[PDB]
Amino acid sequence: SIKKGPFVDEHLMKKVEAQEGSEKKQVIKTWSRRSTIFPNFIGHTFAVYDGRKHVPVYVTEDMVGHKLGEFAPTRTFKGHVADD
Amino acid sequence: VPKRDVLPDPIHNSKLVTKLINKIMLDGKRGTAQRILYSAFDLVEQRSGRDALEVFEEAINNIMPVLEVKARSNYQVPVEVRPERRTTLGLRWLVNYARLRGEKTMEDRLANEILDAANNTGGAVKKREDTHKMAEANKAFAH
Amino acid sequence: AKTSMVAKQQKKQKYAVREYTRCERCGRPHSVYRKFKLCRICFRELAYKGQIPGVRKASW
Amino acid sequence: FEIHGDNLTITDAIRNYIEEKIGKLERYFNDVPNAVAHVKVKTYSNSATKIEVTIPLKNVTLRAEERNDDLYAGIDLINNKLERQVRKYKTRINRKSRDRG
Amino acid sequence: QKIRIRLKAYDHRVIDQSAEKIVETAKRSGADVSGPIPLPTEKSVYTIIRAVHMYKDSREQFEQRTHKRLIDIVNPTPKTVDALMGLNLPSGVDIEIKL
Amino acid sequence: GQKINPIGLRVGIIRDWEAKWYAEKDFASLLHEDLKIRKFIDNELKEASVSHVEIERAANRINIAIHTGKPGMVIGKGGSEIEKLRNKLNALTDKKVHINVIEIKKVDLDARLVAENIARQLENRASFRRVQKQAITRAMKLGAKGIKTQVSGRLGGADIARAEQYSEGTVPLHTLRADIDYAHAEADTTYGKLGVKVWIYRG
Amino acid sequence: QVEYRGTGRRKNSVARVRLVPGEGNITVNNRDVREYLPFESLILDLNQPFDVTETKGNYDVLVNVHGGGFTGQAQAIRHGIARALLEADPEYRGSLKRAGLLTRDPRMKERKKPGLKAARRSPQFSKR
RNA sequence: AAGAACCUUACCAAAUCUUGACAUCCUUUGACAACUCUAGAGAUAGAGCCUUCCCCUUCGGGGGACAAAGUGACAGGUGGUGCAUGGUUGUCGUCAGCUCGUGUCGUGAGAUGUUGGGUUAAGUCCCGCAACGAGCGCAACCCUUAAGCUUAGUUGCCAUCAUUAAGUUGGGCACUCUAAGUUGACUGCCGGUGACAAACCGGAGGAAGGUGGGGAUGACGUCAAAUCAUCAUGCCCCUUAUGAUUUGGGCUACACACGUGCUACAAUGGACAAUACAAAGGGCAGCGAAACCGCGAGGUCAAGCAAAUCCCAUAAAGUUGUUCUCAGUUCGGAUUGUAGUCUGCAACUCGACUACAUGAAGCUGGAAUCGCUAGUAAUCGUAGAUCAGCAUGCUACGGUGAAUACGUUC
């Protein structure tokens, strides 16, 4: 949990507040592990270093039980014989 | 190698009841075992108004065999069984035949059983018999 | 690897805890006290030297 | 069954081969819950072929062992030991009954 | 209402003989001494394994002695002050002066 | 089992501590501070063939004495090295230290001197069982009731390690009051590490 | 008055027994025993010194006990009393020591040691 | 591996690097840099900026130590060889046997002693015995505990006292208890027995009588046993890398089996409410006391404390009354998700813990197979290490408390 209240890496913040004014860019290489959601990180599209390389996503409205610490389950197919 | 005396039972000033408690005294919880047993006293001493020692000595003598056998390939021999092992025998067949009655309460099945063999009924008098059937069927090939 | 893990532990950190205290003499990281910073087997290795009390043995 | 082998990556033809040839012994009695095998390679410098195996039993276990040049001849030895083993273990036993008194 | 100290030795006689020679220093110029009151001498342990890699079950125990030894004296004169601070050896004690 | 040195056992009852100082939970500083002194005396272990040393510390100062076999060697002559060695320990100790050296007699009897003696001359390519035979031949000489003298490693600068030992006399171990000596050494010529084990019996 | 004394020790449970002649009436640390020890109705066996030595009785009871649970604590009662009656007069060692009552059976809980887990049993073995 | 989010973690990824991550030798020489700015994923660098010869200099040097560089060796290698090794350990197994010196007999290897009888926990002891003596080994020998006397009485105790809610106050050290020295149990002593002797049974006393309890201790050798990945090290190999810093993953995935253990399959039971008894350890900015907040987690301040003083703390099982009345149950709490607490910046892959609900199989387990000779088995809890966080584990402590041992057939 968090101790009242939410945090962020703040070196990504230095990026978003820079790209936040103009027609917002949608391309990011980043690290995105200790950075949780808030709606200034929008207008911008995130490809996070997954464990091996960076991996995009179109950010979208429904992102409430979700965050960018990882959204690619990294066990990489699967590790398992059967599927889900 | 000797056998772990009980001083007396301080109920009845007896001995046998403690020898039985220690078979009922699950978890070492004599408090609950002597609980359920004292309940057993008042209940059975109510039904067919009598004493424990009457239904107790009666029914403990009604299931208690005077023979049982043993193997030694395995040849099964008849022997007059020794008395203390015969005691714990009656105790053990008693209680182990008791709990399988499919009956809820701690005590009712017990008094049902000692009252059973009190009239020469019950499967512990029955096993006494089958012991005494194998025995004297066991005289031929082993005696 | 080992030789540079030795330098890994004693150089600085980012914050409090991503840091370990293994044994000085041997590089044994796991199962080691913080009292003396001495591993499982370094104390035995230097218990017999009997520098310290120490006892050794068998009363408890 | 349990097969760990150092300094080598196992293959599959050896599996069907060895374990089928072991399966031939259900003449007596198989009885096949566990069958632990064991290997290693070891410079001499002629330099090895370790062929070691357990073939445990009901109420008891066993050991057959061998070192070789090669796994085929070297294996025909983990078998043609266990054979003679299992055989005896069954002979045994003692029936020549005999009344008494 | 008198001097009181605490001695901690890891050999179980130096407490006694040191206690008594410093008592001699203490009653030389003084008197009214309470003795070496024993304290339980709590212990320690170290469950060490007889191995390097494995065989965790074959292990053994080093331990420790931590004795406390409580000694006093009443009715000071500055010469029994020196009886405290005149002789301290063998200094394996954890000597602590108080009142 | 298998076996283990009895100096682990006889200590805590009937022999010394290989160091001493008073008691408080800063063992950490005191301990490893001492351990490098115990290393730093390689300066003289290379130079005197000493047995060992066990310290005892003061309130604010340090008392020591190395149990040595080569007295005129450790002394210098006119104390030409004693005070600079005070400085050098003090320098690297980072604390004042009062040297007071102590010779050992009977002559080179105990585990240490004997052990690295035979190891070194063995590493002079010595027919060792004769050298061992000579050690015992001057050991029963000096007076002690049981010696036994083991060694291992790839002997002869050859193939696989085996280990010889020449026993002697009465040297009980399962006993508990013996006050005896034991060591292990390390010195190699060609193949690995060749180590010895010494055993004697006083009273 | 004159309170004889015996002192019993079982299972961490010391029994400073202040026996005195009189009626016979229990105070486990300023408290009767009957309510105290769970449950318990085994106090017949505790006046055993009166059961078999100078039988019946009685002498009055004060007692200062502490340590352990009731059982060994209810067993230092005996050695407290009987040792106090040998202290009263060893006349009846020939009916006490025929029941012992001075054998502080020193059995106890041994140390823990490898293999012992949540209840004391040797391990289970590997199989097949 | 006595605590895999990062770390540890080396494996994978990339940003980087190469006398390097890291040291010793030779130099310019210099006290080595605090805090910020730029960007960065950090590493870091541009940097600013302030590190700035401190010991002794008679003017120079010496010198702790430098700034990175130069300097060639170098450094390093979780890179391999436990079969090239040392050291250490499990093992049969705490099984009691294993050895020599002398002398003999033998053509000879060898045996003798070490065997025969009896006996013992056992090469224990004795009788006999071309044999006799020793070496290792067994027991004692060290620890800890039951019974005890003496020394020393707190932070420990009140036996006599009044006093306090209260051993708290004044008083006492009597008594438990307290840590050091003291005997006592040594077949010692008595009876019987026995080749009389060794020695067995019983008796007396005694707390302990039969190597008292338990631990410590593992003879010769076997497993080419485990270990280069504790540490060191023989040989080989890398060295713009198999060496290195930096961030992220991950070592934890599961169609599968196995092994390991923890937990229910309930009315001695389950749930409710009142109540008692333990031991042992730890504690400095660490043990957290009341009072306060809340469903709880937890947080407010801070009482007391390097400790027989203050805290962890409260004990649990038990017992007390109530009810439940045999169910897939008031059993079961897995599961899934909702909501809070604590940790570290950091709880997605990956910390538990707190209230809500959801309530699975499972109604005692086939064949198979394991431990245990009494405070045992069986059973309830406590605390120590590891520790920012984390134990169905381990370790230590206790409290409760059984059946069976005929006989060694097998």
From Swiss-Prot, chain A:
NCBIfam families: rpsS_bact
Protein name: Small ribosomal subunit protein uS19
Organism (species): Staphylococcus aureus (strain NCTC 8325 / PS 47)
One function term, GO molecular function aspect: structural constituent of ribosome
Disulfide-bonded cysteines: none
Pfam families (UniProt xref): Ribosomal_S19
Gene symbol of the encoding locus: rpsS
Primary role: Protein S19 forms a complex with S13 that binds strongly to the 16S ribosomal RNA.
Keywords, in A-Z order: Ribonucleoprotein, Ribosomal protein, RNA-binding, rRNA-binding
Protein family: Belongs to the universal ribosomal protein uS19 family.
Domain of life: Bacteria
PANTHER family from the UniProt entry: RIBOSOMAL PROTEIN S19P FAMILY MEMBER, SMALL RIBOSOMAL SUBUNIT PROTEIN US19M
One Gene Ontology biological process: ribosomal small subunit assembly
InterPro entries referenced in this protein's UniProt entry, alphabetically: Ribosomal_uS19, Ribosomal_uS19_bac-type, Ribosomal_uS19_CS, Ribosomal_uS19_SF
HAMAP family: Ribosomal_uS19
One GO term describing the cellular component: cytoplasm
From Swiss-Prot, chain B:
PROSITE patterns found in the cross-reference section: RIBOSOMAL_S7
Transmembrane segments annotated in the record for this chain: none
Coiled coil location: none
GO MF terms held by the record: mRNA binding; rRNA binding; structural constituent of ribosome; tRNA binding
GO process terms (BP): ribosomal small subunit assembly; translation
Keyword line: Ribonucleoprotein, Ribosomal protein, RNA-binding, rRNA-binding, tRNA-binding
Pfam families: Ribosomal_S7 (PF00177)
GO cellular component, one term: cytosolic small ribosomal subunit
Listed InterPro entries: Ribosomal_uS7, Ribosomal_uS7_bac/org-type, Ribosomal_uS7_CS, Ribosomal_uS7_dom, Ribosomal_uS7_dom_sf
NCBIfam families, A to Z: rpsG_bact
Oligomeric form and interacting partners: Part of the 30S ribosomal subunit. Contacts proteins S9 and S11.
Family: Belongs to the universal ribosomal protein uS7 family.
Function: One of the primary rRNA binding proteins, it binds directly to 16S rRNA where it nucleates assembly of the head domain of the 30S subunit. Is located at the subunit interface close to the decoding center, probably blocks exit of the E-site tRNA.
PANTHER family (UniProt xref): RIBOSOMAL PROTEIN S7
Protein name: Small ribosomal subunit protein uS7
UniProtKB/Swiss-Prot annotation, chain E:
Top-level taxon: Bacteria
Physiological role: Involved in the binding of tRNA to the ribosomes.
Any one of the GO CC terms: ribosome
Oligomeric and partner information: Part of the 30S ribosomal subunit.
Record-level GO BP terms: translation
InterPro entries: Ribosomal_uS10 (IPR001848), Ribosomal_uS10_CS (IPR018268), Ribosomal_uS10_dom (IPR027486), Ribosomal_uS10_dom_sf (IPR036838)
UniProt key word Ribosomal protein: yes
UniProt keyword annotation of Oxidoreductase present: no
Keyword terms of this UniProt record: Ribonucleoprotein, Ribosomal protein
Biological classification of the source: Bacteria, Bacillati, Bacillota, Bacilli, Bacillales
Annotated GO MF terms: structural constituent of ribosome; tRNA binding
Gene3D superfamilies per record: Ribosomal protein S10 domain
Family as reported in the entry's similarity comment: Belongs to the universal ribosomal protein uS10 family.
Annotated protein name in UniProt: Small ribosomal subunit protein uS10
Swiss-Prot record, chain F:
Family matches, as SMART domains: KH
UniProt GO BP: translation
Domain of life: Bacteria
Molecular functions per Gene Ontology: mRNA binding; rRNA binding; structural constituent of ribosome
GO CC annotations on file: cytosolic small ribosomal subunit
Domain KH type-2: 37-105
Family: Belongs to the universal ribosomal protein uS3 family.
InterPro entries attached to this UniProt entry: KH_dom, KH_dom-like_a/b, KH_dom_type_2, KH_sf_prok-type, Ribosomal_S3_C_sf, Ribosomal_uS3_bac-typ, Ribosomal_uS3_C, Ribosomal_uS3_CS
Pfam families linked: KH_2, Ribosomal_S3_C
Name of the protein in its database record: Small ribosomal subunit protein uS3
UniProt keyword annotations, A-Z: Ribonucleoprotein, Ribosomal protein, RNA-binding, rRNA-binding
Subunit structure: Part of the 30S ribosomal subunit. Forms a tight complex with proteins S10 and S14.
Function: Binds the lower part of the 30S subunit head. Binds mRNA in the 70S ribosome, positioning it for translation.
